[PDB]
Design a protein around this ligand. Structure first.
Ligand code: HEM
Ligand SMILES: c1ccc(-c2ncc[nH]2)cc1
Length: 405
């Protein structure tokens, strides 16, 4: 389902990539997207799927487009258009200077200082979930750890019931990796019916949870409105209920397959921080974009006002011009260049939180279960969209090789 080519698009710039169902999916999701960086592909392409939009394919252009908020606006950041249009999350659907006051607030709730405080719980939950898995010699890493781990730390942060997990998880999934089951606006609305009451309650009777802090915060010397809070909190939820979860499975899937990688981390733990960045580069997973606010000529191509462009965060560090041998995982690379957490004014607030959850999981898992592999006859399926993921991750191990702590 290709849309008829708009007049301004040079036909030699057409490259029909489906962000929602790329061609090489079976070989892996990052591998599927990297086709855009082969030699036959121009740097800035036009795709006809998903209603027609541009895709920047190079580190350099993505960074530039991200830096340039004047031309490339966060007003409509999701593709297809109907979705970018219904998108009203804060601070994500706003441009500087307006964006800045809301970011300052969200930062309060997820910043370094909050992570610093939640550390022992992170570490505590990891050790617990692991040790519980250990003696089984088998899990579904996706369902058994990848989801619980990050989700429960978030529920805790927000002060929301663990019971709510499934519902929230399905609505998040429809936003990022649309099923067909629900339009973006419907998913958005339902997350919203969920939050409203909770926000009301916390305006009235404040706690110390992230929601109460957002609900009663100040933006530009005045109190935030209800709609504003609803809209920040909605982002906070989806923000992490989805990204960390998928990142862990990609990383774990790689670890299950690379014995020498695990060993390296076991013998030289000083290297975990470095390995973490390398995994962030190699298993990068987000893809969103921007809307053109006017006619503008970028890298020789004519962008008409209203055009949407996909600026894949995923692709910058997979770009050979940026990283030599990009598909190879090397924990000792001199410079790990990525834009996994984004670029420009919208750089991820939650990065500190995500790195802490990543490092803990790796140190913690390797300690207890140093030797594990993918289950025999398991076929791992990746999925694509705004946030790419792993469907399920069957792992097997010999209990006798574990170590209880
Ligand atoms: C592996 C994990 C994560 C990845 C890969 C990631 C990726 C991203 C990216 C690429 C952006 C920028 C999007 C744009 O410029 O439109 C972003 C923004 C954001 N992320 Fe993260 N994220 C991760 C984890 C989290 C966590 C754990 C949270 C906390 C709930 C979160 C909250 C946010 C927020 C609040 C913003 C918006 C910042 C602003 O608009 O100024 N993310 N993230
Ligand atoms: C980075 C990753 C995901 C999001 C997002 N917004 C709504 C659903 N998911 C935004 C930024």
């Amino acid at each position: 389902n290709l849309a008829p080519l708009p007049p301004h698009v040079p036909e030699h710039l057409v490259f029909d990539f489906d962000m929602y169902n790329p061609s090489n999916l079976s070989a892996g999701v990052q591998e599927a997207w990297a086709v855009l960086q082969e030699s036959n592909v121009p740097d800035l392409v036009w795709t006809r799927c998903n209603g027609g939009h541009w895709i920047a394919t190079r580190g350099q252009l993505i960074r530039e487009a991200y830096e340039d908020y004047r031309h490339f606006s966060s007003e409509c950041p999701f593709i297809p258009r109907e979705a970018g249009e219904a998108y009203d999350f804060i601070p994500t659907s706003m441009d500087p200077p307006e964006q800045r006051q809301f970011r300052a607030l969200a930062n309060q709730v997820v910043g370094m200082p909050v992570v610093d405080k939640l550390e022992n719980r992170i570490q505590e939950l990891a050790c617990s979930l692991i040790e519980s898995l250990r003696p089984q010699g088998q899990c579904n890493f996706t369902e058994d750890y990848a989801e619980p781990f990050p989700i429960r730390i978030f529920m805790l942060l927000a002060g929301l019931p663990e019971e709510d997990i499934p519902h929230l998880k399905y609505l998040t999934d429809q936003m990022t990796r649309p099923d067909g089951s629900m339009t973006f606006a419907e998913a958005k609305e339902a997350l919203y019916d969920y939050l409203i009451p909770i926000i009301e309650q916390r305006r009235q009777k404040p706690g110390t949870d992230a929601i109460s802090i957002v609900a009663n915060g100040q933006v530009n010397g005045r109190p935030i409105t209800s709609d504003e809070a609803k809209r920040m909190c909605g982002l906070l939820l989806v923000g992490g209920l989805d990204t960390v979860v998928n990142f862990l499975s990609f990383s774990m899937e790689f670890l299950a397959k690379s014995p020498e990688h695990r060993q390296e981390l076991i013998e030289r733990p000083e290297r975990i921080p470095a390995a973490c960045e390398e995994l962030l580069r190699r298993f990068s997973l987000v893809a969103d974009g921007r809307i053109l606010t006017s006619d503008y000529e970028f890298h020789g191509v004519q962008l008409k006002k209203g055009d949407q462009i996909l600026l894949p965060q995923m692709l910058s560090g997979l770009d050979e011009r940026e990283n030599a041998c990009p598909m190879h995982v090397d924990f000792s690379r001199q410079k790990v260049s990525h834009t996994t957490f984004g670029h420009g004014s919208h750089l991820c607030l939650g990065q500190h939180l995500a790195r802490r959850e990543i490092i803990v999981t790796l140190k913690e898992w390797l300690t207890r279960i140093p030797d594990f592999s993918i289950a025999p006859g398991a076929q791992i399926q990746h999925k694509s969209g705004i946030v790419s993921g792993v469907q399920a991750l069957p792992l097997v191990w010999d209990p006798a090789t574990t170590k209880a702590v």
